[PDB]
Amino acid sequence: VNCETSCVQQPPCFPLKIPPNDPRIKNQADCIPFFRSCPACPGSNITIRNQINALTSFVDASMVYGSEEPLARNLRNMSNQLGLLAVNQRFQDNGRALLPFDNLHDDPCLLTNRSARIPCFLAGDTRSSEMPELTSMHTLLLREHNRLATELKSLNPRWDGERLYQEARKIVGAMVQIITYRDYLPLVLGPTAMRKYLPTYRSYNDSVDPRIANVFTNAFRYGHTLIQPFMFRLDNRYQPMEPNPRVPLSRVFFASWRVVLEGGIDPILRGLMATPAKLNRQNQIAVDEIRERLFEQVMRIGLDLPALNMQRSRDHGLPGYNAWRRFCGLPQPETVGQLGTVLRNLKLARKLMEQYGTPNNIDIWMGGVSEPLKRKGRVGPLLACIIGTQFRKLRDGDRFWWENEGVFSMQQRQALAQISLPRIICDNTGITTVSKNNIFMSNSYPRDFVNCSTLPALNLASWRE
Amino acid sequence: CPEQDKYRTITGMCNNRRSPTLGASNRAFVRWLPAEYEDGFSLPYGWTPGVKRNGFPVALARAVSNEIVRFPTDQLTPDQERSLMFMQWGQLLDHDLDFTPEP
Numbered sequence: 001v002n003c004e005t006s007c008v009q010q011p012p013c014f015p016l017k018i019p020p021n022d023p024r025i026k027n028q029a030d031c032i033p034f035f036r037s038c039p040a041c042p043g044s045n046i047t048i049r050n051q052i053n054a055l056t057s058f059v060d061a062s063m064v065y066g067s068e069e070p071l072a073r074n075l076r077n078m079s080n081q082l083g084l085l086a087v088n089q090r091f092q093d094n095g096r097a098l099l100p101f102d103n104l105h106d107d108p109c110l111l112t113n114r115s116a117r118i119p120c121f122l123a124g125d126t127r128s129s130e131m132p133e134l135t136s137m138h139t140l141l142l143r144e145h146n147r148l149a150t151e152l153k154s155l156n157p158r159w160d161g162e163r164l165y166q167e168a169r170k171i172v173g174a175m176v177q178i179i180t181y182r183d184y185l186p187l188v189l190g191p192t193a194m195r196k197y198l199p200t201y202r203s204y205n206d207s208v209d210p211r212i213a214n215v216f217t218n219a220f221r222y223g224h225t226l227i228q229p230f231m232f233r234l235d236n237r238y239q240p241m242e243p244n245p246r247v248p249l250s251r252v253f254f255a256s257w258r259v260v261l262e263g264g265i266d267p268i269l270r271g272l273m274a275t276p277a278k279l280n281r282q283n284q285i286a287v288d289e290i291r292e293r294l295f296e297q298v299m300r301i302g303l304d305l306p307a308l309n310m311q312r313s314r315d316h317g318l319p320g321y322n323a324w325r326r327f328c329g330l331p332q333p334e335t336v337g338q339l340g341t342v343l344r345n346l347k348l349a350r351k352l353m354e355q356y357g358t359p360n361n362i363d364i365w366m367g368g369v370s371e372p373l374k375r376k377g378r379v380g381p382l383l384a385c386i387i388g389t390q391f392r393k394l395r396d397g398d399r400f401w402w403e404n405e406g407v408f409s410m411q412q413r414q415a416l417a418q419i420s421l422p423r424i425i426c427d428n429t430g431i432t433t434v435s436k437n438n439i440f441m442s443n444s445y446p447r448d449f450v451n452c453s454t455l456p457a458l459n460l461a462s463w464r465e
Numbered sequence: 466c467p468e469q470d471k472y473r474t475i476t477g478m479c480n481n482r483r484s485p486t487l488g489a490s491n492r493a494f495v496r497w498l499p500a501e502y503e504d505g506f507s508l509p510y511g512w513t514p515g516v517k518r519n520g521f522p523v524a525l526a527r528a529v530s531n532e533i534v535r536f537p538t539d540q541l542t543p544d545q546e547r548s549l550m551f552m553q554w555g556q557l558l559d560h561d562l563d564f565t566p567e568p
């Protein structure tokens with residue numbers, strides 16, 4: 001029953017079969033490996049199979065602090081009373097902190113470069129080393145926590161380590177909430193869906209269920225359509241950083257050695273700010289770096305991320321496209337002509353019907369990313385409904401939402417309203433010219449770039465006790 | 466479940482005092498629609514050869530990817546209104562919300 005090396009369909013394996021005339025896998029007895037998600041009730045003949053969320057659903061920066069207590073303690077520096085998160089003891093990035101290394105028995109990062117001998121990083125979430133751009137964001141927030149704990153210690157010298165850790169952790173979580181709901185989500189949903197699904201915050205409502213819904217784990221994978229086929233690294237003039245300024249994505253997965261030995265997080269953060277995202281188009285859905293070569297370096301065969309999304313929605317028992325359209329209050333097309341009208345594209349409607357027979361059977365990710373995008377948004381109506389509905393429950397059903405009374409003082413809320421992702425980059429990196437707000441829209445140097453001194457900073461004066 | 470607190474727990478337990486595991490880690494997802502399985506309760510569509518879904522054969526996930534998702538890389542359209550930071554924040558944010566474990 002080894003899903004990694006075998007093609008036998010026996011629990012817990014659900015391998016993806018290979019179609020005839022596949023462009024890459026000529027052997028039809030081969031497969032793309034797949035392990036079914038752990039069931040919430042293993043072995044049951046009574047319960048309808050459901051899956052598990054290993055993380056806190058709240059937007060609480062659990063990807064920095066961890067979602068389980070032993071890990072949360074292990075991520076802390078408990079050698080002193082400074083409330084810091086532990087940092088790498090072997091390497092620094094031009095004098096700045098790096099994430100500590102993990103101690104995995106099976107480490108995939110070590111495989112990406114034998115001589116480098118750079119293991120996976122240890123962070124609040126286990127996927128921190130999946131791509132260096134993601135590692136750079138984790139490293140940025142680790143530095144921001146320590147920067148806040150350091151400033152809070154000089155402001156309140158009697159605060160012990162626990163107090164410093166908890167107060168800096170609270171600020172980091174609020175920053176993630178503000179960047180997400182003020183800057184990020186309006187650019188995902190577009191203005192009209194933003195007003196519909198995320199109206200003005202009123203107060204904490206203890207009857208709003210804050211759990212992640214099973215469908216969101218698949219729907220939020222719309223972001224796979226934004227992925228560029230390279231990791232772009234730029235110098236301090238936002239010019240290509242030679243000799244490898246555009247590394248194919250299939251050579252950066254688990255490549256923690258690139259962060260440590262190829263220039264740290266600054267060239268990566270610059271590449272993220274000054275390179276456009278890929279645009280999702282109906283005939284340009286997702287790149288072959290993830291469709292043919294996902295984790296190619298460390299697996300026996302390259303994976304197909306879009307196909308894994310579809311097999312995963314099947315594994316999770318997710319209903320098809322029309323059921324979700326109906327759930328959202330959206331019309332459900334039954335014919336290829338009706339599907340053509342929804343998509344403003346009869347050619348794509350015919351290709352979808354040739355695969356699925358009926359729009360009732362279109363896998364949720366596939367149907368969701370096929371819809372024309374909402375004005376000033378990057379999802380169509382179906383994904384905007386699922387995503388918008390999820391983020392409203394995470395906001396209204398969170399007792400520690402940054403605007404909920406009792407979480408912060410009014411003065412602290414006013415100070416927090418001045419934070420931004422470009423400011424976090426300024427404060428924790430060697431980069432002094434960053435994207436202007438909104439960082440998620442700004443993408444061209446020098447047109448959309450400003451110096452760090454023009455941005456407001458977080459004033460911690462109202463945290464003095 | 467304490468009556469008075471100041472900071473979040475690490476697991477998310479006690480955020481909702483009436484149902485204290487809601488939003489907490491290592492708990493089953495909530496469902497917005499009932500699940501759809503081949504046998505009604507556990508086997509995924511595509512598990513058994515020849516078993517149709519709602520009157521139609523199940524398409525291989527790799528066949529749908531080959532026929533609908535595949536496109537020539539050089540055709541990629543850069544988004545004039547979004548940076549690659551828009552993609553990266555989405556993945557970082559997703560890693561604050563959900564991780565579905567496998568055996």
Ligand SMILES: *[C@@H]1O[C@H](CO[C@@H]2O[C@@H](C)[C@@H](O)[C@@H](O)[C@@H]2O)[C@@H](O[C@@H]2O[C@H](CO)[C@@H](O[C@@H]3O[C@H](CO[C@H]4O[C@H](CO)[C@@H](O)[C@H](O)[C@@H]4O)[C@@H](O)[C@H](O[C@H]4O[C@H](CO)[C@@H](O)[C@H](O)[C@@H]4O)[C@@H]3O)[C@H](O)[C@H]2NC(C)=O)[C@H](O)[C@H]1NC(C)=O
Binds near residue numbers: 205206207396
């Ligand atoms: C605190 O939040 C509560 C949850 O709110 C939801 O989530 C937030 C994030 C927002 O999206 C919000 O819009 C959501 O509603 C909220 O409580 C909710 O309040 C609504 C409105 O009162 C309740 O809806 C009523 O439900 C009953 C029961 O049937 C429902 O459940 C069954 C089973 O799932 C479904 O099959 C039904 O379709 C319903 O969904 C209905 O009978 C009722 O409709 C009838 O009555 C109204 C007049 O009251 C008529 O206009 C209709 O035509 C019908 O004749 C409503 O649909 C909802 O059940 C309730 N949820 C919970 C969890 O309690 C609460 O009000 C918020 N409080 C504050 C102060 O903000």
Ligand code: HEC
Binds near residue numbers: 312
């Ligand atoms: C905006 C959203 C978003 C972006 C961008 C994104 N992902 Fe996804 N991805 C998800 C979510 C949500 C899931 C489901 C996570 C879970 O619950 O386990 C997912 C799941 C996955 C999975 C699990 C596939 C399976 O077996 O079902 C892989 C692998 C993956 N993503 C790789 C990547 C990689 C590699 C990148 C970029 C370097 C990436 N993703 C970027 C949202 C994203």
Ligand SMILES: Nc1cc([C@H](CCN[C@]23CC[C@](c4ccccc4)(CC2)CC3)c2ccccc2)c2nn[nH]c2n1
Binds near residue numbers: 106107126127130299
């Ligand atoms: N639910 C998920 C899952 C993943 C992957 C799953 C990867 N599975 C492997 C990849 C390589 C492997 C290995 C180890 C040693 C030697 C050779 C190969 C064998 C399978 C270790 C883990 C992940 C999960 C956890 C940590 C990082 C990435 C995601 N990545 N981004 N978003 C994701 N969402």
Ligand SMILES: *[C@@H]1O[C@H](CO)[C@@H](O)[C@H](O)[C@H]1NC(C)=O
Binds near residue numbers: 088
């Ligand atoms: C803990 O903090 C001290 C002081 O900043 C530092 O010297 C030490 O390296 C830290 N330890 C870890 C494991 O991060």
Ligand SMILES: *[C@@H]1O[C@H](CO)[C@@H](O)[C@H](O)[C@H]1NC(C)=O
Binds near residue numbers: 112
């Ligand atoms: C491995 O890392 C070293 C840097 O220490 C680099 O010179 C070498 O080219 C890398 N090899 C590969 C295959 O990337």
Ligand SMILES: [Ca+2]
Binds near residue numbers: 055061562
């Ligand atoms: Ca969380």
Ligand SMILES: [Cl-]
Binds near residue numbers: 089100
């Ligand atoms: Cl270390």
Ligand SMILES: [Cl-]
Binds near residue numbers: 214496
């Ligand atoms: Cl669901």
